[PDB]
Amino acid sequence: NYGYQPLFEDRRPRNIGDTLTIVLQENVSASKSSSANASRDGKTSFGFDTVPRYLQGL
Amino acid sequence: NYGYQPLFEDRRPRNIGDTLTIVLQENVSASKSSSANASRDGKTSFGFDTVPRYLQGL
Numbered sequence: 001n002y003g004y005q006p007l008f009e010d011r012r013p014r015n016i017g018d019t020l021t022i023v024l025q026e027n028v029s030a031s032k033s034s035s036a037n038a039s040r041d042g043k044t045s046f047g048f049d050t051v052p053r054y055l056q057g058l
Numbered sequence: 059n060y061g062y063q064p065l066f067e068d069r070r071p072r073n074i075g076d077t078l079t080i081v082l083q084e085n086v087s088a089s090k091s092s093s094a095n096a097s098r099d100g101k102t103s104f105g106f107d108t109v110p111r112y113l114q115g116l
Binding site for chain 2: 028030050052
């Protein structure tokens with residue numbers, strides 16, 4: 001004797017020892033990315049190629 | 059016995075121990091960028107290639 005068994009209810013595990021099918025379908029995909037940058041360029045110049053006479057002391 | 063179980067309400071977790079499915083879907087993307095620049099160019103010239111006689115002292 002197996003006890004009350006339903007007639008229209010789906011066949012589910014109910015007690016200890018009942019078997020159940022597991023469809024293993026795992027798909028995990030995690031990602032991360034990052035970046036940082038900095039730049040700085042400078043040029044300076046001053047040339048008195050021909051100095052006038054009133055400014056040759058400076 | 060499991061207590062009052064609704065019939066048309068969706069199957070939600072209500073008490074401690076109930077299971078809930080989480081669909082992990084994260085998509086975060088932050089960005090920032092900036093720049094600055096400056097420039098300055100100068101030329102000056104004066105040439106008395108042929109100096110007139112009344113101006114040869116200056």
